[PDB]
Amino acid sequence: TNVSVPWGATLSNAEHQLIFYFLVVAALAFVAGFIRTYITRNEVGSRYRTAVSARLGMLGVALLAYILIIVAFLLGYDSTAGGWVPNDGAINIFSTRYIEWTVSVPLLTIELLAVCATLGVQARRNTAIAVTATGAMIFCGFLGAIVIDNGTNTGAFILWAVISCVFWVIANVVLIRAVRQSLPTLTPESHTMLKSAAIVLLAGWVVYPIVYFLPLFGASGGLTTTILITLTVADVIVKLGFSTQTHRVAKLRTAEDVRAGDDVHPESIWISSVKQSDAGLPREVYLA
Amino acid sequence: TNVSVPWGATLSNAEHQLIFYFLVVAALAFVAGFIRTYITRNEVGSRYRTAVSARLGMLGVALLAYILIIVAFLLGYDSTAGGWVPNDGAINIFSTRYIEWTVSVPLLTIELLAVCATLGVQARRNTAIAVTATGAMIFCGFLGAIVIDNGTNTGAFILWAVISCVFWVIANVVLIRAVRQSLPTLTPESHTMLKSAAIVLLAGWVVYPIVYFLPLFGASGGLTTTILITLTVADVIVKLGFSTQTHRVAKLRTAEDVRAGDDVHPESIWISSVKQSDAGLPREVYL
Amino acid sequence: NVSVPWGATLSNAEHQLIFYFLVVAALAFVAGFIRTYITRNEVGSRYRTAVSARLGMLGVALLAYILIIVAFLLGYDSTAGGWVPNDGAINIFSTRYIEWTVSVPLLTIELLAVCATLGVQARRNTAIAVTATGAMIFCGFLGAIVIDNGTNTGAFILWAVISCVFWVIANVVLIRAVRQSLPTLTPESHTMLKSAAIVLLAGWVVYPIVYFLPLFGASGGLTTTILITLTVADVIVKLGFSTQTHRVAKLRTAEDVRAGDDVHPESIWISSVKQSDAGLPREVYLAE
Amino acid sequence: TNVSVPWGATLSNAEHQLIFYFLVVAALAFVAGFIRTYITRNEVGSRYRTAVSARLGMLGVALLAYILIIVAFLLGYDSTAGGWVPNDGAINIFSTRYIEWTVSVPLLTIELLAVCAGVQARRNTAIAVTATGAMIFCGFLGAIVIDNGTNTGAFILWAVISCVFWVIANVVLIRAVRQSLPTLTPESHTMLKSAAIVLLAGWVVYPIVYFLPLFGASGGLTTTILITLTVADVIVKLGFSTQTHRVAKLRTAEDVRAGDDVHPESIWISSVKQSDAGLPREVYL
Amino acid sequence: NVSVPWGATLSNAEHQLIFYFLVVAALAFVAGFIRTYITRNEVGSRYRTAVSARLGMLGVALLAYILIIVAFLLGYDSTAGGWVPNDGAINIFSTRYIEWTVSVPLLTIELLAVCATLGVQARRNTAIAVTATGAMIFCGFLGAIVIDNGTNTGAFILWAVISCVFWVIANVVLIRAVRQSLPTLTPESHTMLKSAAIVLLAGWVVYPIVYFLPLFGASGGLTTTILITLTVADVIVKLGFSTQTHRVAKLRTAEDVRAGDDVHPESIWISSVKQSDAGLPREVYL
Ligand SMILES: *C/C=C(C)/C=C/C=C(C)/C=C/C1=C(C)CCCC1(C)C
Ligand SMILES: *C/C=C(C)/C=C/C=C(C)/C=C/C1=C(C)CCCC1(C)C
Ligand SMILES: *C/C=C(C)/C=C/C=C(C)/C=C/C1=C(C)CCCC1(C)C
Ligand SMILES: *C/C=C(C)/C=C/C=C(C)/C=C/C1=C(C)CCCC1(C)C
Ligand SMILES: *C/C=C(C)/C=C/C=C(C)/C=C/C1=C(C)CCCC1(C)C
């Protein structure tokens, strides 16, 4: 049992405050993001609408999830003379974040695949692999960290982490292939953006596995705090800052389809205060 | 008596965690689905809007229902240090799922019937039968499993299950007939989709009856866990993965009506990244 | 003495059934509310009052039934196979009255909206119906719950009689409005409105009947019958009957389109049969 | 004479039920109103949209406010042998309504001023908002804040100060209506005047209910005060809400008929068509 | 050494006033949020970022003030001496920081969005402003609450100074962005942006001032002043100032319409004066 469960460490009043601060800030940040995404939903064409639906979903899930995390945090610790002593529900705080990831990660995959121009059959199978892979990845981590022996078995904590890494590789491969296959077809401007979005979205992922193995280096009120805050900052940075990257690709791809004369969009599309497309209406049709 | 109520079995800390995980994940999955369905609502024409309304409703019901299920689970169990001992309200967890099905299943019927080209009163009669049948199917199961003798009576548990199966057959027949009657009128591409949707939507149903009869083979923390999780996974797989099927049919049927020149749609309709219809605006009218 | 229903003890089976129907009802309204909202632009500006009223009714019902459910959960205490009523049990019955007070009046407006009543004639009718319906429920509430904690037989009867007076006033005005409008409407519209009017008003009888049941004694079974019957009645009326009014509005909209009186942006379909074709208002060049 | 705080009176089980009934009914009535206002938001042009925004806001504030009032009522009283005995939180019920008025009243001003006709319009809005805001705050200070509302002197003094603000508000609005009436069409002229009169008249009820506690305290009086205010809030904030909207719609239809601007959908008032549907002329850039 | 405000006992009158302003504020935001949402299509696609930012800020404020209200209700206990602070009283002050952490940054984006800085320069400007404003509040939270439960006078001041450094960085970038954009804008537009920039930035001073009040001692009256003043400040800025940014966007939209740069579906009206007439995009063949 070389594993030192983080929900066992007692927290200082200062630490307790910091965790709460970041958790709520995150939740509010998602509310702001969710609102933005919704209002800026018709800035994209019908073809890439799946990208908008996915991100809005991810943000929605994150908001509600972080509300549960906050609740668990409030019911997970009790105030004493020595600070905030963990109770039976403390484990729920860590558990809830996994739930978030289980649904959030898969949706991200779809978002990237949505902006990716993979056509017909190749695309459908890719989606299934990515979703199942990402879903399994988090489930394996949850099993090892929380489900098995109340996360007290050192070997499983590692074994399942390795199994998860397997899925992480499967996911990255499929996505990277899809991005690589689509890059040549896109315009130079589009090509650069997709690659940029793909790299930004996948890079951050490493932080999560790193934070997962931190408990092995021992237990501490400070460590527990670091684990929670780091993960929170990571969730916000990725699920928020990276959210715009996918959207931008969709918008440009939309404007390009307009300029190219492939389709007509109701409103002018602007990126970085530069006009990419002009407002257009479909030609009136007289039915038989 | 041979019936071993699942809400009587004690659950391990691991089991308790797993159940919670799947329940919440499911609820969140529905929120994501509900959001998607809403945003992708104008991708369909006015003719097949009933399909969109039904699915969004089903998802909405599921979301709220699973919230109740989750709450009951949290307020339905207590920790004894030997696991989680059921409260008097734990039965509510199982009860709530029935409530979900009672409202959710009927809406599904309407959704399939909506994509179906069955028109006139004959189709209206079909809707009434499907809804009433599906509604009764779940109610009969609820009566036997929970209402009668607090689910301690083996006779009712089975009798009512059989009565329910009767309704299940009535529902499947009407729906299958409606799909079969509509299939010939639809285009080849549309024909394939409806059949596909019909098969996928109806097939899964079998899982529910199977899980219902599991308690007869005894009671255990593991079994109780299997029952709950399996049903949850089933609900998500059907109410979600199967939801897209109906929507796609509606979109294509809309695009076809556009191409055929029968009707006009404001935006281009894309399926599988392949354009099915082009942007169109109705002719300006003078009075 | 009047045998108050909130005094009778309920079996575990009975308690479960009541909960089942209450929640199912609430969820049914959520499904209805969602449908009504999505299918709001299927109607013209002229009959929008009908849409606003139904969506309102459904919204009120949903929230109301949530309160009813809460009251039900806090109104009874478990005693090993039996549920003994507490001081809050009365609230369950009280809450339904609140629902009716707001819900019934909105229904009136909905029917009157689809009705062809023009000018003041229409406005006057609405005022009478709303005030009448509003008072009818209030009178019942006073006799059944407010006066002597609902234990006075004389008041229970007196106020019910007063209520019936208002019920007659309401039915008369509405029936007249429907009868006056039927001749002007098309055959297809005539059938729907008449059907809606008849369907909407007929069910009302059930409510008064259930009200006087307590007089014939008190029992766990009776109390169960009262609650469930009212719930089934609320759902059947507020839901199944909701479509009837909406359909009239849609057809009346399509008729206005075909007749060339007005233009609708999208095609209107009833029972899979096209009633109207998509039309756009003629572009106008303002003086500028 | 003597100020007798209403949150001191014990309430009967019957009284407790009545108050709950009206409070919830009111809240639900606002939900129904809020939904209607939202659905019937595009029935008005861009010029008078401030009227729609204001009313929807007022209704929204009222709904949430009445939710707090209901909560306070549930946590403000404890059930006893003699009925429902007030606790420390009972005062919150009365306090919450003031909060509602402080935000709700100002929005109403904007709504009427929105339908009303330049630069001096902005000044008028500032006066109305500040005046209305202060009027309620002054009453709050005297009735609740000062000496826990047990002082007859302030209860009256501050009421008088408030009345001063009430006069300022009514004057600005009355002037705005009077100044605008001549410019508007006869049909529009009648509407605005009608709306102005209906919106301002009711206000008197609030001050009247305020001074009732002076004539003593009782479970019945406390009940009368609460219910009357509730009925008043619903009647004004709801029935009166339509008045402003109608003016906006007609003024929109007039702009359409006159050819000044175009509206996408047909505008109907009293089951009578005011404007036929129109789309803006396609523009090349 | 620092007299924490959550240590002072409050009178029944004081307790009532704080509650009054807090709720009024929350409701004011609800009214604002509703208005902003309904008046979202009064602006063009080009300046939509401004609308998205303000609606977000208002949304955050509303929810935040709900938490502040809850904390206030669970932070004090009624006694014979008035309302005695408990362990949760500190949360009231803590929650406001959370609000500011998300609210302030969004404001920056809103002003920068109306600002015409083009290319990465605006994106670079955005990143600095967001991070600067974010850090500013975090530093204050650290010193006021996190460090020694706000009992260390040196930190209370040190971190305040560090924060002020960030405040200067933020003001500079924004002022530069406004100054750089001002020349490109029309005279009418130019005036509004400057006014909005000045109005948005000026108020900021109040917050730092209120922060250092606890140093001059602790009291039920002072605690009351701190809370109410901040609340009034939040509403006045986040609300009254919200319109300023929006108005600029609307005019800039109308100008683009008149100039023939873009087409807007509906007429745009500011102060009851028509700025742009309704226009529909030309139907296109593919
Ligand atoms: C929006 C949130 C995201 C993208 C979260 C991602 C999380 C991971 C990539 C987690 C991966 C893990 C491993 C590869 C090994 C250890 C267990 C996990 C689940 C933390
Ligand atoms: C979205 C959820 C769905 C479609 C659930 C379906 C459930 C059934 C088809 C249940 C059928 C049953 C029987 C035929 C016998 C035993 C009792 C039931 C209700 C489980
Ligand atoms: C959505 C619910 C509806 C339309 C409910 C209608 C209820 C009534 C018509 C009630 C009438 C009553 C009497 C005429 C006498 C006894 C008391 C009442 C209120 C139940
Ligand atoms: C929507 C609610 C409205 C318009 C409420 C209005 C309230 C008043 C006009 C109150 C006025 C008062 C006085 C003039 C004196 C006493 C104190 C007040 C605030 C009740
Ligand atoms: C919408 C709310 C706003 C803009 C709040 C602004 C707050 C500040 C400008 C705070 C600045 C501070 C310092 C510069 C020093 C002391 C600590 C702070 C955070 C209060």
Beta bridge partners of D273: D268
Element (H, E) at B139: helix B121-142
| Token pair of C288 as six digits | 């500028």
The CA C282 to ligand 4 mean position distance, Å, reads 49
- Which other chains touch chain C, taking contact as 3+ CB pairs less than 8 Å apart? B, D, E
Cβ distance D282 to A281 less than 8 Å, yes or no, reads yes
Contacts for E95 with CB less than 8 Å, ≥ 6 apart = A24, E64, E67, E68, E71
Which has the closest alpha carbon to C142: E126, D17, E31, E62? D17
Q: Are B166 and B207 in contact (CB under 8 A)?
A: no
Domain spanning D6-275, CATH class: mainly alpha
Cited resolution, angstroms: 3.0
Which residue's alpha carbon is at the smallest distance from atom 10 of ligand 1? A208
What is the CA C164 to chain-centroid distance, rounded?
A: 17
**First CA to last CA across chain E, in angstroms?**
75
Cβ-Cβ contacts under 8 Å, E278 against chain C: 286
Contacts for C205 with CB less than 8 Å, ≥ 6 apart = none
Q: What is the CB neighbour count within 10 angstroms for residue A264?
A: 24
Angle at D115 between CA E238 and CA D238, to 5 degrees: 80
Q: How far apart are CA C33 and CA B258, in angstroms?
A: 30
Measured from CB, residues less than 6 Å from any atom of ligand 5 are E 100, 103-104, 107, 136-137, 140, 160, 163-164, 167, 204, 207-208, 211, 234, 237-238
Instruction: List Cα–Cα distances, C113 to A3, B57, C172, in angstroms.
Output: 69, 26, 16
Which has the closest alpha carbon to E68: E138, E21, E13? E21
Amino acid code (one letter) for D23: L
**Helix, strand, coil: what percent of chain E each, to 5?**
75, 5, 20
Q: How far apart are CA C62 and CA C57, in angstroms?
A: 9
Q: Are D129 and D110 in contact (CB under 8 A)?
A: yes
Instruction: List Cα–Cα distances, D5 to B199, D10, D149, D151, in angstroms.
Output: 70, 12, 7, 10
Q: What is the CB neighbour count within 10 angstroms for residue D279?
A: 18
Tell me how far apart the 2 most distant CA atoms of chain B are, in Å.
79
| Token pair of B108 as six digits | 């599904």
Beta bridge partners of A184: none
- D63 and C CB contact within 8 Å: no
Which has the closest alpha carbon to C211: C151, C135, C152, C143? C143
| Token pair of A240 as six digits | 């928020």
Q: How far apart are CA B50 and CA C176, in angstroms?
A: 33
- B273 and A CB contact within 8 Å: yes
What is the CA D252 to chain-centroid distance, rounded?
A: 24
Specify the residue for token string 């729920």: A92
The beta-carbon neighbor of D17 closest among C94, C99, C101 is C94
Q: How far apart are CA A95 and CA B17, in angstroms?
A: 8
Strand, coil or helix: B86: strand
Which sign does the torsion angle of CA D185, D189, D192, D195 carry?
negative
The CA B138 to ligand 2 mean position distance, Å, reads 6
Question: What is residue B148's DSSP assignment?
Answer: G
Q: How far apart are CA A178 and CA A113, in angstroms?
A: 7
| Token pair of D146 as six digits | 């000062």
- A286 and B CB contact within 8 Å: yes
CATH code of the region E8-255:
1.20.1070.10
- B256 and C CB contact within 8 Å: no
Cβ-Cβ contacts under 8 Å, D272 against chain C: 118-119
> Which residue from D minimizes the CA distance to E77?
D88
Amino acid code (one letter) for B88: D
Which has the closest alpha carbon to D222: D99, D101, D90, D96? D90
C33 CB within 6 A, ligand 3: no
Cβ distance C283 to E280 less than 8 Å, yes or no, reads yes
Q: What is the CB neighbour count within 10 angstroms for residue C123?
A: 13
Q: How far apart are CA B56 and CA B60, in angstroms?
A: 6
Contacts for A172 with CB less than 8 Å, ≥ 6 apart = A202, A205
**First CA to last CA across chain B, in angstroms?**
76
Strand, coil or helix: E277: coil
Specify the residue for token string 């959001």: B35
Q: Are C199 and C244 in contact (CB under 8 A)?
A: yes
Which sign does the torsion angle of CA B124, B129, B135, B138 carry?
negative
A239 CB within 6 A, ligand 1: yes
Q: How far apart are CA E282 and CA E268, in angstroms?
A: 20
> Which residue from D minimizes the CA distance to C264?
D265
C-to-N gaps above 2.5 Å in chain C, after residues: none
Specify the residue for token string 């009169």: D197
Specify the residue for token string 């943000």: A59
CATH among 1.20.1070.10, 3.20.20.70, 3.40.1390.10, 3.90.1860.10 for C5-272: 1.20.1070.10
Q: What is the CA radius of gyration of chain E?
A: 21
The crossing angle, in degrees rounded to 10, of helices A242-259 and A49-76 is 170
Q: Are strands B281-282 and A284-285 parallel, antiparallel or unpaired?
A: parallel
What is the CA D28 to chain-centroid distance, rounded?
A: 16
Contacts for A92 with CB less than 8 Å, ≥ 6 apart = A72, A75, A76, B20
- C87 and E CB contact within 8 Å: no
Q: How far apart are CA D199 and CA D220, in angstroms?
A: 29
HEC letters along chain C: CCCCHHHCCEEHHHHHHHHHHHHHHHHHHHHHHHHHHHCCCCCCCCCHHHHHHHHHHHHHHHHHHHHHHHHHHHHEEECCCEEEECCCHHHHHHHHHHHHHHHHHHHHHHHHHHCCCCHHHHHHHHHHHHHHHHHHHHHHHHHHHHHHHHCCHHHHHHHHHHHHHHHHHHHHHHHHHHHHHCCCCCHHHHHHHHHHHHHHHHHHHHHHHHHCHHHHCCCHHHHHHHHHHHHHHHHHHHHHHHHHHHHHHHHHHHHHHHCCCCCCCCCEEECCEEEECCCEECEECCCC
| Token pair of A94 as six digits | 């860590």
Q: So where are chain B's domains?
A: 6-277
The CA B211 to ligand 2 mean position distance, Å, reads 10
Mutate to test the pocket of ligand 4, among D66, D101, D230, D236 (most ligand atoms within 8 A of CB): D101
Which has the closest alpha carbon to E42: E286, E254, E279? E254
- D71 and C CB contact within 8 Å: no
Cβ-Cβ contacts under 8 Å, D281 against chain A: none
Which residue's alpha carbon is at the smallest distance from atom 13 of ligand 5? E208
Which residue's alpha carbon is at the smallest distance from atom 9 of ligand 5? E204
Contacts for C254 with CB less than 8 Å, ≥ 6 apart = C264, C268, C270, C275, C276
Q: Are D103 and E31 in contact (CB under 8 A)?
A: yes
| Helical ranges in chain D per DSSP H | 13-39, 49-76, 90-115, 120-140, 152-180, 186-201, 205-210, 219-234, 240-257
Cβ distance A45 to B272 less than 8 Å, yes or no, reads no
Distance in Å, alpha carbon of C215 to nearest chain E alpha carbon: 46
What is the CA E108 to chain-centroid distance, rounded?
A: 9
The beta-carbon neighbor of D53 closest among E35, E267, E269 is E35
| Token pair of E17 as six digits | 């006033």
Instruction: List Cα–Cα distances, D144 to C145, D9, D96, D212, E210, in angstroms.
Output: 33, 16, 11, 15, 27
Contacts of residues B135-142 at CB distance under 8 Å and 24 or more positions apart, as own/partner, are B135/B102, B135/B105, B135/B106, B136/B164, B136/B167, B137/B105, B137/B164, B137/B167, B137/B168, B137/B171, B138/B98, B138/B101, B138/B102, B138/B105, B138/B164, B139/B102, B140/B164, B140/B167, B141/B98, B141/B212, B142/B95, B142/B98, B142/B102, B142/C20
Question: What is residue B33's DSSP assignment?
Answer: H
Fold entry, domain B6-277: Rhopdopsin 7-helix transmembrane proteins (1.20.1070)
Q: How many CA atoms lie within 13 A of C183 on its CB side?
A: 5
Q: What is the CB neighbour count within 10 angstroms for residue C90?
A: 22
Which has the closest alpha carbon to E276: E257, E248, E260, E262? E257
Instruction: List Cα–Cα distances, E72 to A21, C236, D63, E75, in angstroms.
Output: 17, 45, 22, 5
| Token pair of D243 as six digits | 């008045």
Specify the residue for token string 């005539």: C190
Cβ distance D122 to E271 less than 8 Å, yes or no, reads yes
Q: How far apart are CA D170 and CA B125, in angstroms?
A: 61
Specify the residue for token string 């909060």: D99
Contacts for D17 with CB less than 8 Å, ≥ 6 apart = C90, C94, C145, C146
Q: How far apart are CA C178 and CA C197, in angstroms?
A: 7
Give buried/exposed letters for E147-163 (b at 16+ CB in 10 A, else e): bbbbeeeebbeebbebb
Amino acid code (one letter) for D239: G
Q: Are E214 and E233 in contact (CB under 8 A)?
A: no
Q: What is the CA radius of gyration of chain D?
A: 21
Instruction: List Cα–Cα distances, B61 to A61, A147, B28, B97, in angstroms.
Output: 17, 30, 13, 11
Q: How far apart are CA C54 and CA C36, in angstroms?
A: 8
Element (H, E) at E180: helix E153-181
Question: What is residue D283's DSSP assignment?
Answer: E
Which has the closest alpha carbon to C81: C181, C10, C27? C10
| Token pair of C243 as six digits | 């479509």
HEC letters along chain A: CCCCCHHHCCECHHHHHHHHHHHHHHHHHHHHHHHHHHHCCCCCCCCCHHHHHHHHHHHHHHHHHHHHHHHHHHHHEEECCCCEEECCCHHHHHHHHHHHHHHHHHHHHHHHHHHCCCCCHHHHHHHHHHHHHHHHHHHHHHHHHHHHHHHCCHHHHHHHHHHHHHHHHHHHHHHHHHHHHHCCCCCHHHHHHHHHHHHHHHHHHHHHHHHHCHHHHCCCHHHHHHHHHHHHHHHHHHHHHHHHHHHHHHHHHHHHHHHCCCCCCCCCEEECCEEEECCCEECEECCC
The CA D37 to ligand 4 mean position distance, Å, reads 24
For chains C and D, count residue pairs whose Cβ atoms are closer than 8 Å: 110
Contacts for C262 with CB less than 8 Å, ≥ 6 apart = B287, C44, C46, C253, C256, D266, D273, D276, D277
Q: Are D77 and D93 in contact (CB under 8 A)?
A: no
Q: Are E36 and E54 in contact (CB under 8 A)?
A: yes
Distance in Å, alpha carbon of B285 to nearest chain E alpha carbon: 16
Instruction: List Cα–Cα distances, A275 to A251, B109, C69, D31, E44, in angstroms.
Output: 11, 47, 54, 42, 12
| Helical ranges in E4-152 per DSSP H | 12-38, 48-75, 89-114, 120-141
